[PDB]
Amino acid sequence: GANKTVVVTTILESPYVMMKKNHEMLEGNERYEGYCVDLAAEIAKHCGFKYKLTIVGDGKYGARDADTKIWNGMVGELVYGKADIAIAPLTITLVREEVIDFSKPFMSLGISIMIKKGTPIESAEDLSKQTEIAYGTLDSGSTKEFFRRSKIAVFDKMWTYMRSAEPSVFVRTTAEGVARVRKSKGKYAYLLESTMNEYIEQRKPCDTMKVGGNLDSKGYGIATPKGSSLGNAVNLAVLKLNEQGLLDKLKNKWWYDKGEC
Amino acid sequence: NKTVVVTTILESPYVMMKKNHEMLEGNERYEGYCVDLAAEIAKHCGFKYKLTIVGDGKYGARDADTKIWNGMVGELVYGKADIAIAPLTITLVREEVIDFSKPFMSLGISIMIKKGTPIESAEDLSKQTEIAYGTLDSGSTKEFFRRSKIAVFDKMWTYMRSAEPSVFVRTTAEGVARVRKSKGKYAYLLESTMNEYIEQRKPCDTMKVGGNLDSKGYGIATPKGSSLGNAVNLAVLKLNEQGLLDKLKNKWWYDKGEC
Ligand SMILES: COc1cccc(Oc2ccc3c(c2)S(=O)(=O)NCN3C2CC2)c1
Ligand SMILES: N[C@@H](CCC(=O)O)C(=O)O
Ligand SMILES: N[C@@H](CCC(=O)O)C(=O)O
Ligand SMILES: [Zn+2]
Ligand SMILES: [Zn+2]
Ligand SMILES: [Zn+2]
Numbered sequence: 001g002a003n004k005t006v007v008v009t010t011i012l013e014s015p016y017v018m019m020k021k022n023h024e025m026l027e028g029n030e031r032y033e034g035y036c037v038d039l040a041a042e043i044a045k046h047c048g049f050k051y052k053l054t055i056v057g058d059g060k061y062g063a064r065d066a067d068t069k070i071w072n073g074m075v076g077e078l079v080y081g082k083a084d085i086a087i088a089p090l091t092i093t094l095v096r097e098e099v100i101d102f103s104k105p106f107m108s109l110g111i112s113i114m115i116k117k118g119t120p121i122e123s124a125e126d127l128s129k130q131t132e133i134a135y136g137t138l139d140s141g142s143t144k145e146f147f148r149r150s151k152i153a154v155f156d157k158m159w160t161y162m163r164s165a166e167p168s169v170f171v172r173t174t175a176e177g178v179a180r181v182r183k184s185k186g187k188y189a190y191l192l193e194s195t196m197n198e199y200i201e202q203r204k205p206c207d208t209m210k211v212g213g214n215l216d217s218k219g220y221g222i223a224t225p226k227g228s229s230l231g232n233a234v235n236l237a238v239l240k241l242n243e244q245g246l247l248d249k250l251k252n253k254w255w256y257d258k259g260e261c
Numbered sequence: 262n263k264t265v266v267v268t269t270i271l272e273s274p275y276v277m278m279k280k281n282h283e284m285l286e287g288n289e290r291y292e293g294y295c296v297d298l299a300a301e302i303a304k305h306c307g308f309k310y311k312l313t314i315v316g317d318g319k320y321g322a323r324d325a326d327t328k329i330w331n332g333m334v335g336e337l338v339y340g341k342a343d344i345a346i347a348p349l350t351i352t353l354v355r356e357e358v359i360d361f362s363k364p365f366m367s368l369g370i371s372i373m374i375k376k377g378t379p380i381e382s383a384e385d386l387s388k389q390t391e392i393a394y395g396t397l398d399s400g401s402t403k404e405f406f407r408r409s410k411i412a413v414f415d416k417m418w419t420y421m422r423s424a425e426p427s428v429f430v431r432t433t434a435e436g437v438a439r440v441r442k443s444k445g446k447y448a449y450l451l452e453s454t455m456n457e458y459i460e461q462r463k464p465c466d467t468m469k470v471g472g473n474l475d476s477k478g479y480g481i482a483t484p485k486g487s488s489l490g491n492a493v494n495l496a497v498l499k500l501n502e503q504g505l506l507d508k509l510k511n512k513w514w515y516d517k518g519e520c
């Protein structure tokens with residue numbers, strides 16, 4: 001009893017969560033729009049709770065600091081009791097599954113390569129066998145951890161280069177990585193999840209593209225604190241929304257119906 | 262320590278009898294993707310296991326009258342097996358009665374045709390009658406069409422449920438054989454994983470057409486509340502991140518390709 005408003009942590013990442021044009025004249029959840037905003041409303045309706053969308057303070061997805069062992073990002077918000085649920089493009093990983101709970105995945109993705117159109121790169125192998133074109137990943141994300149922990153020859157070779165490249169090839173936000181690709185005249189390639197790659201490919205000035213296949217296969221899941229009673233209902237809601245076609249409808253809405261290319 | 266009873270199903274390339282199975286015993290009789298996966302799961306979770314083929318040869322559905330589950334799902338629900346390692350699709354109705362690990366393989370419903378059949382999509386199938394089409398019985402694909410309100414898929418279900426003779430088959434092998442002997446007058450709706458495998462096997466006379474109708478995955482299943490669920494789930498995530506699952510897929514789908 002005593003129903004409480006569910007605190008939802010999320011992250012400003014297009015097209016998942018974006019500020020509306022007139023957000024300063026709106027209140028509460030009405031300030032935001034996007035895929036995860038639509039998904040949050042549906043999860044809440046089917047689970048029967050009220051909620052409040054909050055943007056993660058440090059703007060990070062979630063990683064454990066090697067020195068302090070403290071989790072940052074949305075994962076930290078769940079681990080340390082600042083939020084009840086995370087509805088965001090948060091990647092299911094083993095290290096995260098040990099400290100938080102994930103629903104079954106609501107979106108599939110893989111690590112992919114973003115290039116400026118015309119860049120002579122077709123695969124991760126191509127990137128690893130050359131030096132003219134620099135490449136990097138997002139900081140404090142699952143893509144960086146993938147390369148740091150990989151024992152696969154090609155990916156290990158890529159990590160050896162990235163960790164020691166100077167100036168740093170890592171970026172603080174996805175928008176920073178895309179801008180770097182666009183302004184580097186083809187001398188920077190960005191490693192990011194296929195979902196964000198495919199979205200940017202459909203946005204003006206339509207000068208980037210996804211090349212090659214995905215480097216791995218994984219999914220985004222809705223996250224709750226370990227043992228939270230909310231996890232069960234949220235998981236069943238994700239499965240219901242997928243089977244009813246809602247997740248496919250939302251992706252088409254925010255990726256391709258709004259495409260500008 | 263108890264030997265874990267694993268329920269599975271004879272379905273290529275997931276679980277197959279070895280060519281020399283007759284002179285082998287126990288788990289050594291079988292080979293395939295899920296046989297390799299079971300060995301890895303058991304290794305990382307630290308248990309011994311016995312592979313057993315589901316008695317009724319079904320994946321799992323609930324009888325509308327008696328409400329009794331059949332197939333591998335029933336074996337878990339009624340205590341005859343400790344874990345199911347098979348191409349078992351994660352679905353809402355199943356998640357209510359059994360536990361699933363995070364998915365170890367992705368797939369979608371797809372269309373298998375005899376090469377040359379004038380069909381390009383599910384929409385094409387729905388707007389005609391010359392070419393019959395159906396699904397596997399007691400599986401998640403049949404439930405998908407039964408429970409779907411999407412116009413095209415609802416229209417397809419109305420035809421399939423009333424089609425005479427029955428368009429449903431008892432096994433995937435029966436559906437594939439029906440496509441191959443129909444001279445292009447039967448199309449089979451099945452999961453993309455099995456479709457893509459058959460496409461690369463002799464006599465190389467079928468193909469997958471169109472995109473997938475949905476997006477879902479296979480999970481390792483355990484009885485609700487089973488102590489194995491936690492370790493199995495972490496094992497799947499570790500095997501994926503290590504690249505083992507991608508290695509096994511290439512081993513059994515495309516390294517085995519004969520077309
Ligand atoms: C290691 O192999 C992997 C990794 C990651 C996902 C996967 O297979 C999927 C893909 C999608 C998917 C499911 C399972 S599900 O059935 O868990 N939920 C419904 N969704 C769709 C809404 C996205 C297989
Ligand atoms: N989705 C990733 C962030 C983006 C990336 O790492 O490429 C995560 O959950 O950490
Ligand atoms: N993988 C399906 C069986 C095959 C199908 O229905 O197409 C299931 O778990 O029911
Ligand atoms: Zn709804
Ligand atoms: Zn090359
Ligand atoms: Zn493309």
Ligand SMILES: [Zn+2]
Nearest residue numbers: 301304305505
């Ligand atoms: Zn191993």
Ligand SMILES: [Zn+2]
Nearest residue numbers: 305306496499
């Ligand atoms: Zn292990």
Ligand SMILES: [Zn+2]
Nearest residue numbers: 324325326327
């Ligand atoms: Zn009956």
Ligand SMILES: [Zn+2]
Nearest residue numbers: 398399429430
């Ligand atoms: Zn039947």
Ligand SMILES: [Zn+2]
Nearest residue numbers: 409410415418
């Ligand atoms: Zn209907």
Ligand SMILES: [Zn+2]
Nearest residue numbers: 460468469470
């Ligand atoms: Zn094809």
